[PDB]
């Protein structure tokens, strides 16, 4: 084998402790760059003029943040969707003031995670597996794309990307509620059904399988030792599990087919989260939650408030208070 | 910053005490007969 042939054999090698692969060839440097930039910025980045109004927001630990408050702050509203790599700045000081780390990090991250997904396919192919784990991973990934790329595109600025921080995340959420009434959007409700439901079925499945483990141990040892890695025989009794759950609700509401069950387990959270992601990604173009403001009117024409209108009042508080120095004109049009 | 001056010891003992408990248990597990 020549050098290229050997290299190809190593890259795609199934014997590497961590699979590399061709997707990995892109993934590794981008994720390393993104990670290093993120960590360094999170500790040491100076405040960033996120909203382009020469009002810099401090995101880093050394500039007065803790873990909950800390963030890598989104690039300046003055930049918008302009590509702002380090080399477009006259200096690192300028790059930092205008939030360059945000763009570097999110672009490398999105590239790297796309490659992570491809890499999941690739390894599944190398191991003779079915290929669709990566499709499940498409659910969280799309969501990241929604908040780091699609929303900024729709609104015309990366300053509207989700900040890389916990409280910044909350800021993004509150402002999103103010501007799109996301709670009242059916795609977000499907998202919620997705994660609540995902958790429910995770706990449920966990509990039923745990409930029907076959006795292989004594009381003075963990039941986990009752299973040996790679054993051929199933470690629990699915017939008993189904017997239980089928009586808990009713027979035909219970899975007796493990494959159908696990497919359901995969599909519910993945599809739901796909809808969450599409929710963010379509509210990115301002097709917003249901608006029932003043939907209920009495015979004279008096407005009769519903819970939607109270939501509306909260939303109003959010709208009027956010970015208190950024608006000169009465409507927030993007 | 005007942080709580006990936050350091609180965090340090919060990490160290159970971590140490776990290390004790692991290490005494390893040294048992194979």
């Amino acid at each position: 084998a020549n050098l290229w042939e050997r290299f190809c054999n190593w890259v795609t090698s199934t014997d590497n402790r961590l699979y590399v692969g061709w997707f990995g060839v892109i993934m590794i440097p981008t994720l390393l760059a993104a990670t290093i930039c993120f960590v360094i910025a999170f500790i040491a980045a100076p405040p960033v003029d996120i909203d382009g109004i020469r009002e810099p927001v401090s995101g880093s630990l050394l500039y007065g943040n803790n873990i909950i408050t800390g963030a890598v702050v989104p690039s300046s509203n003055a930049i918008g969707l302009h590509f702002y790599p380090i080399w477009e700045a006259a200096s690192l000081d300028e790059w930092l003031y205008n939030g360059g780390p945000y763009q570097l990090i999110i672009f490398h991250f999105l590239l790297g995670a796309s490659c992570y997904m491809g890499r999941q396919w690739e390894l599944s192919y190398r191991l003779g597996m079915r290929p669709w784990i990566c499709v499940a991973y498409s659910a969280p990934l799309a969501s990241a794309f929604a908040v780091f790329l699609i929303y900024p595109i729709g609104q015309g600025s990366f300053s509207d990307g989700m900040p890389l921080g916990i409280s910044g995340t909350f800021n993004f959420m509150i402002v999103f509620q103010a501007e799109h009434n996301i709670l009242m959007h059916p795609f977000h409700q499907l998202g919620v059904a997705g994660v609540f439901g995902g958790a429910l079925f995770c706990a449920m499945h966990g509990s039923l399988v745990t409930s029907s483990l076959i006795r292989e141990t004594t009381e003075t040892e963990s039941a986990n030792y009752g299973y040996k890695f790679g054993q051929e025989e199933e470690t629990y009794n699915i017939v008993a599990a189904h017997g239980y759950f089928g009586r808990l609700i009713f027979q035909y509401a219970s899975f007796n087919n493990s494959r159908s069950l696990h497919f359901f387990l995969a599909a519910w959270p993945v599809v739901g989260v796909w809808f969450a992601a599409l929710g963010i990604s379509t509210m990115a173009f301002n097709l917003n939650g249901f608006n029932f403001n003043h939907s209920v009117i009495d015979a004279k024409g008096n407005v009769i408030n519903t819970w939607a209108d109270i939501i509306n009042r909260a939303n109003l508080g959010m709208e009027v208070m956010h970015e208190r120095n950024a608006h000169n004109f009465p409507l927030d049009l993007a | 910053m005007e942080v709580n001056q006990l936050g350091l010891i609180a965090t340090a003992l919060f990490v160290l005490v159970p971590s140490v408990f776990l290390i004790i248990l692991y290490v005494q597990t390893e040294s048992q007969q194979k």
């Binding site: 961590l18 500790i43 630990l61 040996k228 | 350091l8 990490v15």
Partner: peptide, 30 residues
């Protein structure tokens, strides 16, 4: 001192990632 604490805990977590991956108890088929 807060920052030192936060970064310290983070670094401990990353090191933990390292040991948990490369120095895990190997899975063995019985």
């Amino acid at each position: 001192m807060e920052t030192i604490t936060y970064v310290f805990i983070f670094a401990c977590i990353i090191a933990l990632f390292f040991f948990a991956i490369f120095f895990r108890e190997p899975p063995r088929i019985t």
